[model samples]
Target chain A: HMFTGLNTPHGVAVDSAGTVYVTDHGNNRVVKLAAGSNTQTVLPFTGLNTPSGVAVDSAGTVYVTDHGNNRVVKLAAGSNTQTVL
Target chain B: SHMFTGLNTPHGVAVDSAGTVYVTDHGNNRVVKLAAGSNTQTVLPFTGLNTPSGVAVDSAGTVYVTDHGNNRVVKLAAGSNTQTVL
Candidate 1:
């Protein structure tokens, strides 16, 4: 629940296990916060101009709104793989 | 590649358990439902949906749309005839 060290965070989603996912607009990346741990960049900053919003599916798949690309990107759970949707 | 396209100024998107995708069309001022893997669209036009911004779907397939222009939320049930202001 701490917003420290975050710049212009946009959308947030909490997993069933209490893991938090946030979209950092200014930094153009999605961060993940485990239950009671600090935030970490789960998805590396690449091929993204301005990340806006985030949504999580029941399967732990992360969907991010890439505003600059005018499309959405999907991040596989527990992996760095990404695909434009 | 299960990506759904043909969105005009799509601000927000929410997907249901049934794989139906709901998008908030900022330019159209309406919410659109896109069936899974189909190009067909079901447009639910509302009069008070001024500049729709966000969308969320509940477990029961109910849609909650955020009207930013009016600063209100509207709920629409799946396959329903009317939208209830919330």
Candidate 2:
């Protein structure tokens, strides 16, 4: 039941620590599954509409393509806010 | 796998530390790699892939692909064709 609630999972990215990020398009949210963890933690990013592609740099900064919003956002390694990229 | 088959609805893409690129051919149910400085792409040898959606590459050149239809993630190490389901 770990991947059960995913409506339309699309983009995926992995950080240096082996955590995986996935964009749940239908549910309009992004979630992360840590290394060896079965439970997915939803990212705190708000206002995402049908987000698609996701990428994480070696430094752990995260980037997401907000497809419905027609913009890209960046989340710094330890930042709670996502800034336009 | 044959590299001649065209990609259909390619979805996710990632670049390795060496600048090599990996992509998920969503509609084609395959993944392809484009080595650094190479124009040609080689279709990875993963079989029974259904709607491969997302991809990522690690610094060690390991590749991870999200098999959408199968609802699982698979990993491929450098220089190896065999994939381990995650």
Candidate 3:
């Protein structure tokens, strides 16, 4: 059985370097799949649940919309910490 | 027709330094360049494109598109319809 760990995955966006950011709604988490790798990094920034849309900029900043909190957050480059945008 | 109004599900849009509007005609699987205050719309000669989602203009006036159907991002350089897979 090929069961994909993801559930209710909605929006996805890729950065310049092929890094993919996806909003996994069912799991109530956001995941990042790096370029040329299958490893899935679960972003702890999912505390604000119900992520709907995601986008990345040229600077490689990951922007996720936390639907429940009514806000948008950005995970800066090379840092696990995030800031409300 | 003096003016135009025949775009089909045009989804994404972006503008360049000269304020030229570039739109992703999603339903038609093409991109169009609409000059400022001009009624003429030039459809970009983008081939092999399926469902284009979002669009963005780089500093060089290059247009990048998220081509969903082709599962790739395509780039159209400034002043040219030639697409380069980024």
Candidate 3: tens digits of C-alpha lDDT, residues A13-61: 5666656566665566777665545467777674777675678888988
Query: CAPRI band of model 1?
Result: acceptable
Candidate 1 local lDDT, B1-86, one digit each (tens): 23545544556677677666666766667777666557567776566677887789899888888886666888887676478888
Tens digits of per-residue lDDT for model 2, A1-85: 5544675567788888778888777788887877667787887788998887888877888899888899998887778888997
The order of the candidates by TM-score, greatest first, is 1, 2, 3
Relative to the unseen true structure, what is the C-alpha lDDT of residue A60 in candidate 3, on a scale of 0 to 100? 81
- Please give, as one word, the docking class of candidate 3: incorrect
> How do all models score by TM-score?
0.80, 0.75, 0.57
Give the per-residue lDDT digits (tens) of candidate 1, residues A1-85: 4545678876787877888888787877778887887546556536876676577777777776676665666766876668666
Error of 3 at B58 (Å): 0.6
Worst 10 residues of 2 chain B by lDDT: B1-10
**Could you tell me the TM-score of candidate 3?**
0.57
Q: Summing lDDT over every window of 10 consecutive residues in candidate 3 chain A, give the lowest-scoring window.
A: A1-10
